[PDB]
Structures are given as C-alpha cells and as structure tokens.
Design an enzyme around this catalytic site. Structure first.
Site, PDB file in Angstrom:
ATOM      1  N   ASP A 229       0.816  -1.191   0.000  1.00 10.92           N
ATOM      2  CA  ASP A 229       0.000   0.000   0.000  1.00 10.92           C
ATOM      3  C   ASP A 229       0.871   1.270   0.000  1.00 10.92           C
ATOM      4  O   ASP A 229       1.817   1.368   0.743  1.00 10.92           O
ATOM      5  CB  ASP A 229      -0.847   0.027   1.277  1.00 10.92           C
ATOM      6  CG  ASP A 229      -1.790   1.230   1.346  1.00 10.92           C
ATOM      7  OD1 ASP A 229      -2.587   1.337   0.416  1.00 10.92           O
ATOM      8  OD2 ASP A 229      -1.766   2.007   2.332  1.00 10.92           O
ATOM      9  N   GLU A 259       1.383  -0.608  -5.052  1.00  7.76           N
ATOM     10  CA  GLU A 259       0.573   0.491  -5.577  1.00  7.76           C
ATOM     11  C   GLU A 259       1.312   1.812  -5.419  1.00  7.76           C
ATOM     12  O   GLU A 259       1.285   2.430  -4.355  1.00  7.76           O
ATOM     13  CB  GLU A 259      -0.790   0.555  -4.918  1.00  7.76           C
ATOM     14  CG  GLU A 259      -1.738   1.514  -5.622  1.00  7.76           C
ATOM     15  CD  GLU A 259      -3.190   1.285  -5.250  1.00  7.76           C
ATOM     16  OE1 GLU A 259      -3.792   0.203  -5.569  1.00  7.76           O
ATOM     17  OE2 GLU A 259      -3.725   2.224  -4.597  1.00  7.76           O
TER      18      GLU A 259
END
Ligand code: CA
Ligand code: CA
Ligand code: NA
Ligand code: NA
EC number: 3.2.1.1
Length: 481
Positions: A229, A259
């Site tokens: 993340d 990400e």
C-alpha cells in the site's frame, strides 16, 4: 496456464463481518472461472470495526483481539480468514496480503511532542517555530497485550502527524529531531507524509520490527505474496529490503505488487529501478488511458493504448487493471472507467499476452456506495472475457492498432492448449470490420464471438486471415467453435 488476479473487495462493502465467509464460498466459482490469485483487503484491526483496513491500528490483530470496539475486523475473524485461505489454496488460488506500513492510525493515547508545521504543498519548507502538540502516537494494544509481539509504539517511531489534539487543529506537523524519509515521491517537495502517524523508516528498531511483522503475517495467513500500500510515501530502499527479507525468511517466491499511484511512466520506472525490479507495480497509466477513452465519446485515439504504460515497457513487472477501490465512484482517486467501455478494457488486459491482469470485485459484483453513480455488477459481461483468457489467449500475438477507433489483436493459439487462439476487436466509436491474421495453422476453422455481441461465424481462410466484425462502442472476441 494464464494467471489472473482478483482484487477481492471494494470500498463500500457492508460492515457485516461476513466477507471472509463470502470469499470462502466463492472459491469454487473463482477457480472455475480462471482466477489464480486474490488480493485480499488489509486483514488487521483498523481504527474502528468499519475501517476498510488502511487505518492500520494493530498489524498483529487479524480479527483476534477485542480492540477498537470489536474482535472482528470489518471482514470477519482471523479464523474465518484462515478458513477462506485454506479453501482458496485447496483450489490452487494464491493469496496476496495487503501490507499497510506507511502509517499507524487510531493510537490508544496522545503524547506531548515538540514539533514544527510544514507547508502541505512543500513539506521540506518549515512554517512555524517549535510548538508543543498532543499527537496520537502511543500504541499499547490493551486488548492484545504482548501476545505475538511486545513491541509498543511511541512518538519517536514516527516522523509526524496531521493532528494536534490540544488546539484541535489539522496541519502537517514534523516531530523534533525527525526528518522526512528519502527516497519517496518528490510531489509536494517530499511525499513521505500522507495520513495518521507517519512511520519513521530512519529508525532502526522500526525497520527491524516491520520486517519481523512481515514474516509473522506471511506465516500466520500462509500468504503467497503481497500487495504493498501507498509505496510512493514509503522509503524505497526500505521497501526493497523488506521484500528481500520476507522472501529470505519464508523461503517462498512471495510475488509482490506495489501500488505506486502516479499517472507517469517515468516515476514508476524510477521506483522500479530504486527497488531493483524485485517487485511489480500496478499499471496506473493504463488505467488513466482507459478512463480517458471511456469519457471522450469516440474522440480518443485508441492507438495510444500501446504507449506510455507500464505494460508497454516492463510487461513482467506490470499488474494491469481497469478500476480499483481508489478509482471507484466517490473515492479519493476517482477516475472510473465508464460502464460502456469497461468490457473493452477488460478485453485489453485479459486477452493480450503482456502483463499480469487483475479483475476488480466492484466491477464483477457492483459497488455498494450510497450514490446513483455506482458501478453496476458486470460479472456476466466479464465472464466470457475471463474464459477467453483461460482457454484461448495463448500463442503468438498480432497487433492491429491502425485506426483511431477500431483496434484489434489476435493470438495464434499454442499446441499446449487445445483449440486455443483468438481474434479480439474493440472500438470507442462506430463499429465495422477488420481483417486480421490468426495463423495459417488455423486455416478453415470456424470461429464465433465468445461475448455473444456478434452472432456471425468467421471462417479462417487458407492464408490464415479472417474478416472480423465489431459493433459500435463494443467488443468481440472470436474463438474456435
Ligand atoms: Ca511515509
Ligand atoms: Ca524519518
Ligand atoms: Na516517514
Ligand atoms: Na477513437
């Protein structure tokens, strides 16, 4: 043989604690439709029961301890998740755990901390003298105690916070003696600070602890890999080292995708270089091309789809996707691929040879936000495309991006997958025809549109070419009857 990922959540799912049980029950359907890995939402306790999981209160509480008003996470209990994973594994579906290590939210208590404000547009610029604030930085984990880890967190494990409880004020505060971590995104001068209490990756006890937790998390849930993340807010060398570490301790491949949210191939390439290409990234630029095509009414040049994407330059490190929990309607990076175009985008990611494609739960099953703009359930339109990938998208590829609107590609098939081969067409504007080469080895076969959008058959000629049709703003994927 082709692998397909699924992000198995969307933002607005109901907080009923049944998500893990739902996942367990969906495992036969997933396996049958060619899904080979699922990315599950963050499995640890957030700031409340209804946290989607990015709050990251207690990384060692997988829905096991009574903390933040609940034992279960939003999604269910540890045991329920472990049973879901066991069912998925029994059907050879791999599981990628979400890793939220940028920050910690929902601290048990405030501490008095000396800090300075920084400019939110340029976090390297200091905008106050020193001041005394009350920051949410003390983590004692009273419901867990020392079960699994006696590590406690204090202000000095963080670089900063966005909230002073004493004056009740929302500003970016950098703690005394701290410096924002590098390398991170250079947006806003330095984009280390995002939200909640920002972890200090200059602190050697913190780097050791997050690494130790990573191995524990992998063991506890028998993870096959990770989704990282918010990585543009986290020291890049640390993320590299963390991935190597967990792979070394587990002795497993641990496929990882990060990400890195930036619509910029260069930034993404810099991230890949600085992490030694040890993990993949989501193909954010491709997502924005899909969104652009979907909103321009036929005006988009569909030829552009071949350039400026992670998958165009680094296919083995691209996880391709259409939409996710940040781009869905109402969310922070909203850029939804409009419903009419969405199957065309799924054809692009699922039937082409490059990239590791990912299907979105919110696209399959719809999103449950409170708006009149939610994504409708498109399972029935995606399933034939998934089947094209699973059974037909093999062998040498031929590209036909030779037109503003109608673009296409073929796959010759591979003798290892019986009856494989396909011919795909998509258009953001008027329909029409395109002659495409599918392989002389396919000569005289009769092909039909697996999506059912076109009902005509195409007989492949002696030279390996067929005349393929597509409707306006549609997709067709021809395969052998
Ligand atoms: Ca950070
Ligand atoms: Ca720091
Ligand atoms: Na930091
Ligand atoms: Na166009």
């Amino acid at each position: 043989l082709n692998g397909t990922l699924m992000q198995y959540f969307e933002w607005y799912m109901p907080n009923d604690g049944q998500h893990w049980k739902r996942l367990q029950n969906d495992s036969a359907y997933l396996a049958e439709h060619g899904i080979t890995a699922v990315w599950i939402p963050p499995a640890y306790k957030g700031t409340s029961q209804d946290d989607v999981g990015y709050g990251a209160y207690d990384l060692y509480d997988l829905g096991e301890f009574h903390q933040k008003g609940t034992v279960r996470t939003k999604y269910g209990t540890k045991g329920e998740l472990q049973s879901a994973i066991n069912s998925l594994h029994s059907r050879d579906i791999n599981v990628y755990g979400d890793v939220v290590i940028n920050h910690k939210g929902g601290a048990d208590a405030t501490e008095y901390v000396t800090a300075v404000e920084v400019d939110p547009a340029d976090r390297n610029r200091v905008t106050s003298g020193e001041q005394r604030i009350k920051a949410w930085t003390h983590f004692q984990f009273p419901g867990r105690g020392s079960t699994y880890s006696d590590f406690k967190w204090y202000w000095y494990h963080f670089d900063g916070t966005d909230w002073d409880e004493s004056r009740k004020l929302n500003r970016i505060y950098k703690f005394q003696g701290k410096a924002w971590d590098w390398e991170v995104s250079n947006e806003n001068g330095n984009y280390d600070y995002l939200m909640y209490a920002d972890i200090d990756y200059d602190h050697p006890d913190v780097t050791a602890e997050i690494k130790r937790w990573g191995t524990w998390y992998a063991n506890e849930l028998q993870l096959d890999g990770f989704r990282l993340d918010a990585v543009k807010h986290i020291k890049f060398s640390f993320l590299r080292d963390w991935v190597n570490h967990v792979r070394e301790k587990t002795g497993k491949e641990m496929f990882t995708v990060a990400e890195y949210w930036q619509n910029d191939l260069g930034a993404l390439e810099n991230y890949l270089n600085k992490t030694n290409f040890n993990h993949s990234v989501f193909d954010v630029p491709l997502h924005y091309q899909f969104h652009a095509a979907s909103t321009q009414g036929g005006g988009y040049d569909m030829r552009k789809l071949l350039n400026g994407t992670v998958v165009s330059k680094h296919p083995v490190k691209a996880v391709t996707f259409v939409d996710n929990h940040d781009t869905q309607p109402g969310q922070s990076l909203e850029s939804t691929v409009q419903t009419w175009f969405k199957p065309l985008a799924y054809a692009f990611i699922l039937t082409r040879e490059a990239g590791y494609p990912q299907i979105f739960y919110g696209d399959m099953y719809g999103t449950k936000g409170a708006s009149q703009r939610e994504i409708p359930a498109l399972k029935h339109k995606i399933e034939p495309i998934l089947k094209a990938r699973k059974q037909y998208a093999y062998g040498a590829q031929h590209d036909y991006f030779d037109h503003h609107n109608i673009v296409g590609w073929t796959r010759e098939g591979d003798s290892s997958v019986a009856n494989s081969g396909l011919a795909a067409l998509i258009t953001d504007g008027p329909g029409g025809t395109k002659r495409m080469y599918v392989g002389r080895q396919n000569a005289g076969e009769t092909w039909h549109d697996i999506t059912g959008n076109r009902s005509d058959s195409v007989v492949i000629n002696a030279e390996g070419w067929g005349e393929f049709h597509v409707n306006g703003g549609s997709v067709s994927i021809y395969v052998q009857r």
